[PDB]
Design a protein around this ligand. Structure first.
Ligand code: EQ5
Ligand code: EQ5
Ligand code: EQ5
Ligand code: EQ5
Lengths: 154, 155, 154, 157, 155, 157
């Protein structure tokens, strides 16, 4: 009965995120991708759809939106583990601070995993920025996502 | 007669801050906590000063004052030339180093850093407010009087 | 059928290590503590005994010695996950390098978890060094370990 | 025919920037200082003021020129027939972000990025910290070229 | 006429090293790879030079030489005053910065750092040898000729 | 009655060390420089040579004294009725290790550790790098006090 939550804004989801989803799904019985909501490029439903489309091959993963404390999202689903990816540019010190806080207030563990080197320099923000000015990020995003991103720009 | 200034916004003061205040007061003849007013937060400057005074009642050589503008001017105006700053998990240490070197260059003021105790190393004013807002229990991370006032602002 | 390997030299095991063991054991069905062998303070068997004594309350954890490639140790037991703790003084850049190498050569994932703040400044080496010169590290080691350490010094 | 681009907002240029310009000009046949502008946020100085302050403090470097631009840095570089960026490191540099951008820039355009550490004396100045300190009266005269300092005080008053 | 020196022990040269060599040769008129002999490794200096030459056959403006003693002397003796060093995962960047500032101070030599490609970012000479020794496959991380010679030393 | 201990091997003392000594002496009533010795590994300089080089370059600091010791730093500190350590930071400092040791020292003995960044000009010198560079003929004269430099060259020849 093992399980972990993979949280983020995923605006949009990248291959970096997808790599981490796949590893979490390979090592825990149950994975929930938690889509944080609050004003980015994609609506929550769009972000959820894009993740669902890219994770179709992952039978034990589902996608849900949430707000408020992440630890509440995790605990309300009977779990107490978070899996978070590391990339180039990750504010790791802040992630550690949040991990220790989350353990303190709710007994939830956080496991960090480095994304694959090939996907280590992509972030949602940098991909949007580059694509905005016409750079090719098609190798860095799921095929579906890439087409829909081009859609919001053009 | 030795002395140091401990600067911050303290909105609100945490046990991380208090740990640092205590270590400074133990090591310098005089300590001034400088509550730095900005372009803004949850507590007023007077409220912040009051919460710090409550938390530091046992420290006779420490006083609390508000300030604005250049930190090194605040320090030198009070006849001192040392700053004591704490380090926690999530501190932007590279920025703190930059500012310390800048402050030494422009005014000859030294900066001493001390790591807060591991128990208080993941608390910050911002994260404590954020967690409390959504109903997380941060009472082990703040002075008792502060936690009481935080509930009040949120209710 | 989930599982992870927790590797180290554990010379001796600390409460920092034990914290990580407990979290791994809480989040995976099966945990194996891998005791690396090659000249420290305790023999391999002693290190193993000390870990077994300190993990008696963890029914799904066992302790075994190993040498050679860690990924071989993991794969030969049907697993492909490593759980590694982070403490103050951890050479994280090196851990990331090894994690990426281990994924490359054998498809093994590495999950990192920060140890509890209270146990974040203890390491096997610093505890031995301090105890050697008479400092009290009894709050930082399992009760059994502490008595046996005093035994090797006196 | 070697060449590199030294990019930044330079609002204003500092002695840390100038140190990097000089090292680049010593090691590449041509250097272009790229004054990159966000058309959606004004800085303290206009583009012409920024360029003027850089030119005045680089008059001794005959193989260096200064041009403004916007959009993708790698397009600025490639349209000039080059494929190298030279970027300085100081105290407070977000090096992880710089590494991310360098890998992305190599990925999308094949442009290389070379980092050089600025001189220790100029290692704690940044445009933003200089402006902030000067705003509140602190003396930053030793950290900025003469072409900048009194123009800065002028903007502030 | 521009130029730079790329120093290291290269025991053995990796694709991480080669990536950096290629970028240097693309950006400077002349590149010298300096194979630095130490108080010791798996390959002799002549073997290391040979492996690098094999791997850099397509780079006409790059040459390979052995050296010892002070790096900045090696650089200045050849009429240059630039060093190009690569960065990978596990690089002790703080030490590299210290050495670059020292090298600038004592001899006026500049150091330019470049990050190796993500694909080659976790390989090092030491980790490649360690993995290969125990039968791990590092052939995607080394030039073909190098991997062939590594097997030989281990067999 | 305030006081701090400035610990190290000082083999030899550098201008980076001296910068830290001076700041400590300016901010505490008394400073003790603790020359910590490993009785199992000789350095380049004997304990008396190390102490002599420090004393000669600190003659202008009347509230500073120099003493050797071994074993636990926190015992050296406490046996002198103090409970503060002042430690410098430079380029190449293993700060994570320093943080680990500071937390351990507070845990076992209640001693506080205060870190100060050394001056930029002295930020890339260390005893070990100075020795290494001097060994191969490099000029480190501007990074060491006069009390040290020719004694170093003497050891090397
Ligand atoms: O970092 C801590 O937890 C307390 C240490 N400290 C001392 C002054 C100060 C100002 C802002 C933030 C932290 C501060
Ligand atoms: O100012 C420094 O210290 C870094 C030197 N540097 C060189 C190019 C550049 C662009 C933006 C910011 C800093 C820059
Ligand atoms: O770091 C890399 O992968 C190659 C970049 N590089 C260039 C010279 C050199 C020397 C030692 C180690 C790495 C080096
Ligand atoms: O040399 C520096 O830059 C750091 C200043 N510092 C002050 C005490 C001390 C002890 C060992 C090493 C360095 C030390």
């Amino acid at each position: 009965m093992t399980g972990a939550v993979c949280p983020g804004s995923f605006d949009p989801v990248t291959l970096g995120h997808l790599d981490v989803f796949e590893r979490a799904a390979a090592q825990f019985d149950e994975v929930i991708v938690a889509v944080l909501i609050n004003a980015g490029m994609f609506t929550v439903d769009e972000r959820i759809e894009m993740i669902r489309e890219s994770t179709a091959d992952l039978p034990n993963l589902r996608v849900e939106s949430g707000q408020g404390l992440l630890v509440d999202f995790v605990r309300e689903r009977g779990l107490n583990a978070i899996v978070k990816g590391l990339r180039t540019g990750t504010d790791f010190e802040y992630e550690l601070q949040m991990a220790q806080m989350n353990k303190h207030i709710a007994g939830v563990d956080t496991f960090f995993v480095a994304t694959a080197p090939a996907y280590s320099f992509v972030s949602s923000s940098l991909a949007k920025e580059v694509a905005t000015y016409g750079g090719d990020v098609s190798a860095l995003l799921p095929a579906s996502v890439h087409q829909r991103l081009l859609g919001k720009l053009r």
